Amino acid sequence: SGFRKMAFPSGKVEGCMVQVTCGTTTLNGLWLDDVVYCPRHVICTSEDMLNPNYEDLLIRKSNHNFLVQAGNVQLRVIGHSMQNCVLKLKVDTANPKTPKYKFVRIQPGQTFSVLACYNGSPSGVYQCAMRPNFTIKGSFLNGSCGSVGFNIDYDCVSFCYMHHMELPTGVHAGTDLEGNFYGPFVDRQTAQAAGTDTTITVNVLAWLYAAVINGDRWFLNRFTTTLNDFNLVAMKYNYEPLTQDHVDILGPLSAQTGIAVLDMCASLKELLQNGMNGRTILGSALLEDEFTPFDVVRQCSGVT
């Protein structure tokens, strides 16, 4: 019993984190086999950031401009290139702690664990969702760039995020490990802003199933609705549309609790129209939307 926001165990990722220095800038890199991946903005001066020509700025760099440290050991850089917004530094030593891994790009609504790092040293772990506006609500200070997000599946680490920057509202933007940004953001000092965000409807439903699994049932009611009518309500309340695919993905939780998704949708419709009447759900006075259906199943089932 209980229901908590839970991160994946971070040990397999900890053993991949290194410090990357270029000139006066230090941030974090990810060392997998004999390549270190880090944000390409590491190469830029302050002035360069106003309008960087990364093709040219990288041409002006050589292996010698990069220092990589794994603990107390200097790794010699023997090659460099870029893939999109990620810099790749080939080093003379393969990481002996490299896990089985994949680079996976995630979709809005999906969650992942972040291992926040400073100076190549892991500092803390938390759970994040990719928001519909392609930002994440992380917790990052200066020096955190190159920290990564990931999921684990059996023995395989799926890396899905590398941290690049903080937007004016204090939310965070970054790339997949192939260096493609999430959202319409660029690694340039220019005016940029988080778009208006919305609530992840399928995740709120998943969390209402979690609440039922954990014995909190007060919001259940005799009514059902249609997918069409529910989506009219969602749109009014700045919730994402619920698709038939979402209904299918909620199938396991629906089967475990015995509550049809469109039955639960009538609960959520009433909560949006009426509020919580001073009550809480799973200890919360807000509807929580950073648990996926899989997150709920994983935690209510005890997968390792």
Ligand X SMILES: *[C@H](N)c1ncn(Cc2nc3cc(Cl)ccc3n2Cc2ccccc2)n1
Positions in 172-191 near ligand X (CB under 6 A): 187-189
Question: What are 117's strand-pairing partners?
Answer: 122
Number of neighbours of residue 196 by Cβ within 10 angstroms: 8
Q: Which is nearer to Na ion, 150 or 207 (CB)?
A: 207
CA separation for the pair 88, 188 (Å, rounded) = 19
Q: What are 36's two structure tokens?
A: 């270190």
Contact residues for Cl ion, defined by CB under 5 A? 223
Binding partner of residue 263 among a copy of itself, Na ion, Cl ion, none, CB cut-off 5 to 8 Å per kind: Na ion
Instruction: Tell which one of 266, 282, 287, 296 touches Na ion (CB under 5 A).
Output: 266
Question: What are 174's strand-pairing partners?
Answer: 163
Residue 246 interacts with ligand X (CB under 6 A): yes or no? no
Q: Minimum distance from CB of 2 to ligand X (Å)? A: 14
Q: Which is nearer to Cl ion, 196 or 274 (CB)?
A: 274
Q: What are 122's two structure tokens?
A: 């892991």
Q: How many residues touch Na ion (CB under 5 A)?
A: 4
Q: Minimum distance from CB of 173 to ligand X (Å)? A: 8
3 touches 282 (CB < 8 A): yes
Contact residues for a copy of itself, defined by CB under 8 A? 1-12, 14-15, 115-119, 121-128, 137-144, 166, 170-172, 214-215, 280, 283-286, 298-304
259 touches 170 (CB < 8 A): no
Sheet holding 77-83, edge to edge: 73-75, 66-70, 17-22, 25-32, 35-39, 86-91, 77-83
- Coil, strand, or helix at residue 40? helix
Residue 30 interacts with ligand X (CB under 6 A): yes or no? no
After which residues, if any, is the chain broken (C to N > 2.5 Å)?
none
Binding partner of residue 189 among a copy of itself, ligand X, Na ion, none, CB cut-off 5 to 8 Å per kind: ligand X
CA separation for the pair 58, 78 (Å, rounded) = 15
Burial, 99: exposed, middle or buried (Cβ in 10 Å; 0-12, 13-18, 19+)? Answer: middle
90 touches 146 (CB < 8 A): no
Q: Minimum distance from CB of 82 to ligand X (Å)? A: 15
Tell me the torsion sign for CA atoms 117, 163, 288, 284.
positive
Q: Which of 128, 145, 160, 265 is catalytic?
A: 145
Question: CA-based angle 4:6:114, to the nearest 5?
Answer: 145
Question: What are 284's strand-pairing partners?
Answer: 281
Binding partner of residue 25 among Cl ion, a copy of itself, ligand X, none, CB cut-off 5 to 8 Å per kind: ligand X
Instruction: Tell which one of 11, 33, 49, 156 touches ligand X (CB under 6 A).
Output: 49
Residue 288 interacts with ligand X (CB under 6 A): yes or no? no
Active site residue 41: yes
Instruction: Tell which one of 53, 63, 221, 284 touches Na ion (CB under 5 A).
Output: 221
Binding partner of residue 266 among Na ion, ligand X, a copy of itself, none, CB cut-off 5 to 8 Å per kind: Na ion
Positions in 116-155 near ligand X (CB under 6 A): 142-145
Q: Which is nearer to Na ion, 180 or 221 (CB)?
A: 221
Q: Which of 41, 164, 172, 246 is catalytic?
A: 41
Active site residues: 41, 145
**Which residues lie near ligand X (CB under 6 A)?**
25, 27, 41, 44-46, 49, 142-145, 164-165, 187-189
